[PDB]
Structure formats: structure tokens, C-alpha cells
Amino acid sequence: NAMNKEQLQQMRQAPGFVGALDQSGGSTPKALKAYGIQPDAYQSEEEMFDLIHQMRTRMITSPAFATGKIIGVILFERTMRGKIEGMPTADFLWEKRHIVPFLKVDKGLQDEANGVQLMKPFPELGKLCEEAVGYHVFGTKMRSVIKQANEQGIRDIVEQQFQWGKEILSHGLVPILEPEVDIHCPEKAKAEEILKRELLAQLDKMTEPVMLKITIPTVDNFYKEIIEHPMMLRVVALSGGYSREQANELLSRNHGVIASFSRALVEGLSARQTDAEFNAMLEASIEDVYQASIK
Amino acid sequence: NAMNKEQLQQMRQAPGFVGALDQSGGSTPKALKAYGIQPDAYQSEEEMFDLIHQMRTRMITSPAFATGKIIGVILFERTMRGKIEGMPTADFLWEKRHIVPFLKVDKGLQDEANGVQLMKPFPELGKLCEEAVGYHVFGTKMRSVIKQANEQGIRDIVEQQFQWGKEILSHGLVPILEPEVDIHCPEKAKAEEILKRELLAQLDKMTEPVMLKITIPTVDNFYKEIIEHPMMLRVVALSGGYSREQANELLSRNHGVIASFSRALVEGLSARQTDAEFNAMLEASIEDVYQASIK
């Protein structure tokens, strides 16, 4: 209620960025390996999930996460059901760190068709949304993928994204729509042209604001009209394959767009480095992403 | 003589890739910070250069560098004048690690004009080349930058690259030409189209082979005709802003092109991590880049 309204204010006004911690089981080995934990070091799914939970706990409890430069955090569903320092993760994010909690609500992608990969339908979405409200989660995130400058395909991406969004809104949660255009798209600017056009037409019909998570565009500042649309709460940006230094550099050139990075935020961090170095490097990466986010 | 010929064979035939360690003074703070050494930790240029020399020593002496997956290494001039385990760096690379040593021979870039940044002229190049021969260095590397699909500009890039190359050859050194097309180029495929066309026309007039270091192309396999040209020894590829995972993924799709990575090879590594983790992560990153390089 008063959280909600204070969280809404943060998400709309506050300078800073969102950390994406929302890797599904299928994406956790890759994140663990990059943290220096090789697949060879665990051999059950439970052990794997503990291991990534220790990582995220180590991030969230670190002094670097107490800065206010990170305004939101996106969670995997298992993490929301877990604890940090004996306290439900979302609650710890907000009560002890002043970070607005979100949850990834998608169940993965369909096979590519029409140059795009739509989200797998998820019948029990509304059940996840009510569960999230029970954890005081403020918003959601959902990812869909554009591989080509296909008008039908991109039309569909956006329409599925907004359907899911109107449904999520109903539950009193703010959805982040994530229609990622692959950075290796043969015609990226063209695809982003279609995407923008579909996006605005949907926003014109909306009666409540949403957020958007997009690849940093080929044309600097291309998303201005989106950022400025009164039904757009905030625009955040995926790295999508760029290094932290590259994403930041391009991000600096997109006025009003803030970061939403996963593995890029965290490059350099490892299991068996001292706590001192972990916090220092984490603090620096955050400062870098912040300075880029605020331009 | 018999090194030379064994090194030539490695560079032409051997599967694997080249590690680029050739950061100038101007680029060393960025590499140090990414290794967890903040600018704030040293305050002279000598201390900075020691610090990056310890890093490179720690890489080169590590068991991960004894794999044969790395076939060449590119050195900054100061490193060539330094030692590893009391032995000149280039000599240690070859005698103790079976890695072919190269040296970066450029002095930086000119201001952008015609959508490109040519290399600053370097009158004493030939003096550096003779010095390098004295250290038993096998080859050189030189970097020039293409920001736009400008025909005059790209014509010039290539012509300067080959002039420098014919000069370097004279000294009995194999040059790696590096005409980098920025990954954020508004018209990358088009620029790579011009680049390829200029490159082939120069190669048709060559009487001795060279090597090429390029951005991974927008069109998969675009450089085939180059790789196949009898005056092309080997094609290597810069990351140029892609994460290690992204560069590897795209690299896998370019048949016969091997990696030549600097900061991407080394993402995850830090000063204050245990020797054990440093070697493990280094070994894994190398294995990854290798598997991508050999496709």
C-alpha cells in the first residue's frame, strides 16, 4: 500500500538501475561457471541451486548492494521462495536494502518461427502472480526474442507481451516487457524500427503504465518517443552479449535509459576471491553501470 | 632460422588461438581495474607498469598457458624488454611454452576523418622491427579503426595497413594487419563489404603472406575468400566489445577464423583470488575460446 506507492515512486523517479538475478535452472550452470564454479563441482540440481543461492546471497548481503544505485532487483522464482539472513528474499531486498523486488514470470521460449521466438504459454501465470503478491513482490519480468526484421513476427512478439502485461497488471503488479532483439540481427535497426512502431501503438491503447527492457538500439536515442510516452514507467536495457564496458558505453549514449544487467554486472566476481576484493569490484562495476545509466 | 620455420608452421597450421597482451600505457589502467586493481592503488607510471607486468607474468607462468591451445601471444613493447622468470619475455614464450611471440608496433590513432581513424605515422618503425628481431620476435600487430561504411576512408585504412605490412616483412617479421570495424557501426555489413573488397585487391598484389585481425563479421563466414587467399597466412578475430560468451558463439560460426582476445580471455580473473581458481578459470576460458576457434 504505502510500500507499493513508495516503490512506484522509486521505479518512476529514482536514478540508478536494476540488477537481474533471475536465471532459471537451465541458465544457472553458465552463471556458476562464470563465477568459477565448474559443472564438475556439484552433481545434483539441489546442490546447484544452493550454490547459485549462496552467490546471490553474497551479492545481496554485500555492502555494495546497500548503495541506492541499484533501485530494483529481478528474482528467479526459487530465490523468492528462499531466504536471505533468515528473511524472505523480496522482503530483505525492500526492508533491509531499499531495493524494489521483481520476479521473472516466463517459462521459456517457443521454437523460432517468423524470425522470432515467442514465450511458451503459461496457464498458471495468475497463480504465480498471486504468490508473488503474497511475497510483496512489486513487479514482474518476461522475456521474448526477435531474431529478424520480420513484421508479422515482431507484431506477434509485442501483442503477446502486452496481453501478458495486462494480465499481470490485474494482479496489481507492474510488468517489465522484454522483447529482446538479438545484437547479431542481420537488420537490427530495421527490426528496432518495427519494434518501436508496434510498441507505441500498443502504448497508445494502454490505460496503465508498464516498463520496457530492450537491447541497446543501433541508432543512439532511438527509443526517445517510448521513454517519453506517458504509459511508459521506465525503460531498462539488457546487455545481450556486450561486455560490461561496451554496454555501459553504448548505454551512456541513450538518454534516460537505465541498465538491467545480469552476467555483465558480475563479470570479474568469483567464488574463491576474498570478501574484500568481491565488494570492491562489485562496488566499482555498480558505480560504472550507474554513471552510464544516469546519462 | 629453424625457430622461424617451426614458428611459421605453427602460425599457418596449428589449431588454437592467440592471446593479445599488448595493451599500451594508455590502456593499462582499464585492464588493471578489470583485474581488481583500481587506479587508486598505484600512483606512478612505474608502479602501474610493474602491476600489469605481474599480471601478465602470472598468466604466462600459469599451467593454463602451457596447453598448446594458445599458439601465439602479442606483446606490448615494454613487456618484450622485460623478463619472465629471469628470461626475456619473447624467449620464454617460445623456449618454455612453445608460444610464438608477436609485438604491437603501432603508436595509436589519428583523429577520425572520412569515418575512419588511421594509425599515427611512426618514423622509427624500422628501428622497433630490428629491436624485435634481436628479441627473436616472430611477428607484429598494428591497429587501425573503421567507424563508418566510407569507401575513401576504408580504401585508406587498407592501403596504410599494407604499406606498413610490406615494410615489416622486409625485416623478416610477419605482420598482423588489424583494421577493426567498430561493432556499433551504423552499417557494419556494408563497411565489411568494402573492407573485404579492398583487402582482396591488396592481397592479389602481394608476393608474401600476411595475417589479418578483424571484427567478427555481421554476415557469418563473410571472410571465406580471404581465409582461402594464398597470401593470407591466418585470420584472427578481435572481440571488440562482445562478452567472451558472445565472441565465442559468433566465432564458432566463422569457419577457419581463430580468436585473438585481450580483456575477454581474462574476464573473471583477479589479483586477490587464489592461484588455484586463477588457473582453473584461465584453463576454462582458454578451452572455451579454443573450441570456438577450431570450428
Tab-separated table of C-alpha atoms in Angstrom, chain B residues 30-249:
chain	number	residue	atom	x	y	z
B	30	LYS	CA	41.384	-0.265	-17.680
B	31	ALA	CA	42.933	-3.755	-17.770
B	32	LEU	CA	44.222	-3.441	-14.195
B	33	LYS	CA	40.784	-2.271	-12.852
B	34	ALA	CA	39.129	-5.237	-14.588
B	35	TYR	CA	41.689	-7.415	-12.743
B	36	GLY	CA	40.537	-5.748	-9.451
B	37	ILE	CA	43.392	-3.265	-9.298
B	38	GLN	CA	41.799	0.181	-9.001
B	39	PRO	CA	43.667	3.324	-10.276
B	40	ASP	CA	43.701	4.354	-6.616
B	41	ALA	CA	46.209	1.526	-5.815
B	42	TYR	CA	49.289	2.888	-7.565
B	43	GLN	CA	50.350	6.475	-8.251
B	44	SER	CA	53.303	6.332	-10.544
B	45	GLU	CA	53.573	5.029	-14.073
B	46	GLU	CA	56.418	2.677	-12.991
B	47	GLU	CA	54.255	1.131	-10.279
B	48	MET	CA	51.383	0.759	-12.798
B	49	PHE	CA	53.659	-0.996	-15.293
B	50	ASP	CA	55.028	-3.370	-12.658
B	51	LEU	CA	51.495	-4.175	-11.658
B	52	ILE	CA	50.395	-5.107	-15.209
B	53	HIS	CA	53.709	-6.959	-15.617
B	54	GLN	CA	52.986	-9.116	-12.575
B	55	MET	CA	49.557	-9.888	-14.086
B	56	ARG	CA	50.975	-10.952	-17.427
B	57	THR	CA	53.723	-12.958	-15.647
B	58	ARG	CA	51.042	-14.655	-13.593
B	59	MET	CA	49.188	-15.525	-16.815
B	60	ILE	CA	52.278	-16.647	-18.740
B	61	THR	CA	53.732	-18.772	-15.921
B	62	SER	CA	50.383	-20.348	-15.174
B	63	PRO	CA	49.841	-24.032	-16.183
B	64	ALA	CA	46.941	-22.842	-18.272
B	65	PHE	CA	49.404	-21.168	-20.642
B	66	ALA	CA	51.203	-24.494	-21.151
B	67	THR	CA	48.417	-26.079	-23.191
B	68	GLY	CA	49.204	-25.586	-26.870
B	69	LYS	CA	45.699	-24.152	-27.328
B	70	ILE	CA	47.327	-20.729	-27.415
B	71	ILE	CA	49.658	-20.693	-30.407
B	72	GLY	CA	50.711	-17.029	-30.398
B	73	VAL	CA	50.953	-14.150	-27.981
B	74	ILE	CA	51.038	-10.415	-28.776
B	75	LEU	CA	53.260	-8.246	-26.538
B	76	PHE	CA	53.431	-4.610	-25.565
B	77	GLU	CA	56.931	-3.212	-26.239
B	78	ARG	CA	57.690	-2.782	-22.519
B	79	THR	CA	56.914	-6.445	-21.881
B	80	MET	CA	59.310	-7.502	-24.619
B	81	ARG	CA	62.021	-5.559	-22.749
B	82	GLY	CA	61.029	-7.274	-19.509
B	83	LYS	CA	61.601	-10.759	-18.179
B	84	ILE	CA	59.674	-13.775	-17.098
B	85	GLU	CA	61.446	-15.954	-14.578
B	86	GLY	CA	64.713	-14.136	-15.363
B	87	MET	CA	64.342	-14.714	-19.077
B	88	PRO	CA	63.350	-12.211	-21.852
B	89	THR	CA	59.575	-12.494	-22.352
B	90	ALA	CA	59.602	-13.478	-26.042
B	91	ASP	CA	62.235	-16.119	-25.402
B	92	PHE	CA	60.216	-17.550	-22.518
B	93	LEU	CA	57.100	-17.603	-24.674
B	94	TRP	CA	58.893	-19.750	-27.282
B	95	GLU	CA	61.526	-21.776	-25.382
B	96	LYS	CA	59.476	-22.648	-22.302
B	97	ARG	CA	55.894	-22.530	-23.597
B	98	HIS	CA	56.052	-23.189	-27.341
B	99	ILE	CA	54.085	-19.961	-27.994
B	100	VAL	CA	55.026	-17.774	-30.968
B	101	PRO	CA	55.772	-14.227	-29.773
B	102	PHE	CA	54.451	-11.062	-31.562
B	103	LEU	CA	54.856	-7.333	-30.791
B	104	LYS	CA	52.300	-4.468	-31.225
B	105	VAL	CA	54.121	-1.915	-33.355
B	106	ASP	CA	51.630	0.940	-33.657
B	107	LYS	CA	51.761	4.218	-31.751
B	108	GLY	CA	47.998	4.893	-31.654
B	109	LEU	CA	45.356	6.561	-33.852
B	110	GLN	CA	44.771	9.785	-35.696
B	111	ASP	CA	41.596	11.816	-35.226
B	112	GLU	CA	38.600	10.423	-37.102
B	113	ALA	CA	38.154	11.653	-40.663
B	114	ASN	CA	36.224	10.007	-43.550
B	115	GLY	CA	34.565	7.692	-40.977
B	116	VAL	CA	37.927	6.142	-40.021
B	117	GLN	CA	40.910	6.504	-37.697
B	118	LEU	CA	44.231	5.832	-39.408
B	119	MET	CA	47.354	4.915	-37.409
B	120	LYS	CA	49.655	7.752	-36.323
B	121	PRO	CA	52.724	7.722	-38.589
B	122	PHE	CA	55.684	6.117	-36.860
B	123	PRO	CA	59.032	7.191	-38.406
B	124	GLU	CA	61.152	4.842	-36.243
B	125	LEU	CA	59.074	1.689	-37.013
B	126	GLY	CA	62.044	0.001	-38.707
B	127	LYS	CA	64.114	0.597	-35.571
B	128	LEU	CA	61.425	-1.207	-33.483
B	129	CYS	CA	61.382	-4.039	-36.016
B	130	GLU	CA	65.170	-4.588	-35.764
B	131	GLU	CA	64.905	-4.451	-31.997
B	132	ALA	CA	62.179	-7.104	-32.140
B	133	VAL	CA	64.284	-9.323	-34.398
B	134	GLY	CA	67.002	-9.031	-31.708
B	135	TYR	CA	64.489	-10.482	-29.207
B	136	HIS	CA	63.573	-13.270	-31.646
B	137	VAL	CA	60.064	-11.871	-32.017
B	138	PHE	CA	58.361	-13.537	-34.980
B	139	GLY	CA	55.730	-11.013	-35.982
B	140	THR	CA	53.948	-7.770	-35.358
B	141	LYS	CA	50.452	-6.359	-34.834
B	142	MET	CA	49.017	-2.984	-35.701
B	143	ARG	CA	45.605	-1.481	-35.173
B	144	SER	CA	43.583	0.948	-37.245
B	145	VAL	CA	39.785	1.640	-36.836
B	146	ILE	CA	36.758	1.903	-39.166
B	147	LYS	CA	33.714	3.720	-37.762
B	148	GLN	CA	31.626	4.049	-40.971
B	149	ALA	CA	30.967	2.487	-44.337
B	150	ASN	CA	33.042	5.143	-46.092
B	151	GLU	CA	34.756	3.967	-49.319
B	152	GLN	CA	37.564	6.554	-49.373
B	153	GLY	CA	38.199	6.045	-45.640
B	154	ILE	CA	38.248	2.267	-45.860
B	155	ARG	CA	40.437	2.434	-49.028
B	156	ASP	CA	42.907	4.435	-46.930
B	157	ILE	CA	42.786	2.150	-43.924
B	158	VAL	CA	43.738	-0.827	-46.048
B	159	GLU	CA	46.427	0.945	-48.062
B	160	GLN	CA	48.146	2.231	-44.924
B	161	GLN	CA	47.868	-1.230	-43.379
B	162	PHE	CA	49.617	-2.870	-46.367
B	163	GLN	CA	52.336	-0.224	-46.686
B	164	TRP	CA	53.226	-0.831	-43.027
B	165	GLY	CA	52.974	-4.573	-43.735
B	166	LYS	CA	55.379	-4.575	-46.673
B	167	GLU	CA	57.819	-2.612	-44.538
B	168	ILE	CA	57.525	-5.024	-41.612
B	169	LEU	CA	58.019	-8.048	-43.947
B	170	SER	CA	61.347	-6.549	-45.076
B	171	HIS	CA	62.679	-7.045	-41.644
B	172	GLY	CA	61.746	-10.721	-41.846
B	173	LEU	CA	58.743	-10.349	-39.484
B	174	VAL	CA	55.166	-11.461	-40.203
B	175	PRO	CA	52.694	-8.543	-39.724
B	176	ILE	CA	49.158	-8.944	-38.424
B	177	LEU	CA	47.069	-6.204	-40.004
B	178	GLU	CA	44.214	-5.005	-37.701
B	179	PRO	CA	41.559	-2.902	-39.486
B	180	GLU	CA	38.885	-3.028	-36.825
B	181	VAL	CA	35.325	-2.213	-37.857
B	182	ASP	CA	33.546	-0.961	-34.708
B	183	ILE	CA	30.759	-3.364	-33.677
B	184	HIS	CA	28.419	-0.385	-33.310
B	185	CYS	CA	29.000	0.711	-36.959
B	186	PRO	CA	25.647	2.047	-38.342
B	187	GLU	CA	26.250	-0.020	-41.462
B	188	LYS	CA	28.565	-2.841	-40.366
B	189	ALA	CA	27.868	-5.367	-43.151
B	190	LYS	CA	28.313	-2.627	-45.745
B	191	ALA	CA	31.625	-1.446	-44.211
B	192	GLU	CA	32.768	-5.099	-44.059
B	193	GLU	CA	31.824	-5.414	-47.754
B	194	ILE	CA	34.115	-2.507	-48.671
B	195	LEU	CA	36.818	-3.755	-46.337
B	196	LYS	CA	36.791	-7.250	-47.841
B	197	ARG	CA	36.952	-5.835	-51.417
B	198	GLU	CA	39.938	-3.587	-50.592
B	199	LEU	CA	41.645	-6.379	-48.711
B	200	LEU	CA	41.492	-8.895	-51.575
B	201	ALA	CA	42.736	-6.324	-54.140
B	202	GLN	CA	45.775	-5.718	-51.987
B	203	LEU	CA	46.337	-9.473	-51.434
B	204	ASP	CA	46.246	-10.103	-55.177
B	205	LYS	CA	49.293	-7.814	-55.499
B	206	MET	CA	51.233	-9.419	-52.601
B	207	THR	CA	54.199	-11.729	-53.079
B	208	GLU	CA	54.420	-12.739	-49.393
B	209	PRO	CA	51.676	-13.817	-46.935
B	210	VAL	CA	50.419	-11.736	-44.037
B	211	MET	CA	47.864	-12.271	-41.272
B	212	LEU	CA	44.644	-10.413	-40.591
B	213	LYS	CA	42.899	-9.467	-37.349
B	214	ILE	CA	39.285	-8.468	-37.887
B	215	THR	CA	35.999	-7.859	-36.052
B	216	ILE	CA	33.790	-10.983	-36.277
B	217	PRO	CA	31.580	-10.137	-39.345
B	218	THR	CA	27.852	-9.452	-39.349
B	219	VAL	CA	27.455	-11.993	-42.170
B	220	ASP	CA	28.598	-15.431	-40.906
B	221	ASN	CA	31.552	-16.777	-42.959
B	222	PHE	CA	31.913	-13.467	-44.885
B	223	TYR	CA	35.711	-13.704	-44.890
B	224	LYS	CA	35.975	-17.114	-46.616
B	225	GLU	CA	37.606	-15.751	-49.775
B	226	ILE	CA	40.146	-14.005	-47.538
B	227	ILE	CA	40.915	-17.106	-45.417
B	228	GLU	CA	41.371	-19.007	-48.664
B	229	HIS	CA	43.614	-16.423	-50.364
B	230	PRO	CA	47.095	-17.936	-50.775
B	231	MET	CA	48.691	-14.713	-49.429
B	232	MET	CA	46.696	-14.951	-46.169
B	233	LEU	CA	48.589	-16.918	-43.518
B	234	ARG	CA	45.838	-16.940	-40.887
B	235	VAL	CA	42.799	-14.911	-39.936
B	236	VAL	CA	42.347	-13.994	-36.256
B	237	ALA	CA	39.462	-12.161	-34.628
B	238	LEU	CA	39.163	-9.336	-32.123
B	239	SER	CA	36.270	-9.415	-29.588
B	240	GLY	CA	35.753	-5.615	-29.922
B	241	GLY	CA	33.150	-5.223	-27.178
B	242	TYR	CA	31.417	-8.601	-27.184
B	243	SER	CA	31.464	-10.654	-23.975
B	244	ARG	CA	33.604	-13.814	-24.033
B	245	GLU	CA	30.446	-15.935	-24.438
B	246	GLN	CA	29.154	-13.794	-27.318
B	247	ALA	CA	32.501	-13.567	-29.159
B	248	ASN	CA	32.938	-17.366	-28.871
B	249	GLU	CA	29.373	-18.029	-30.117
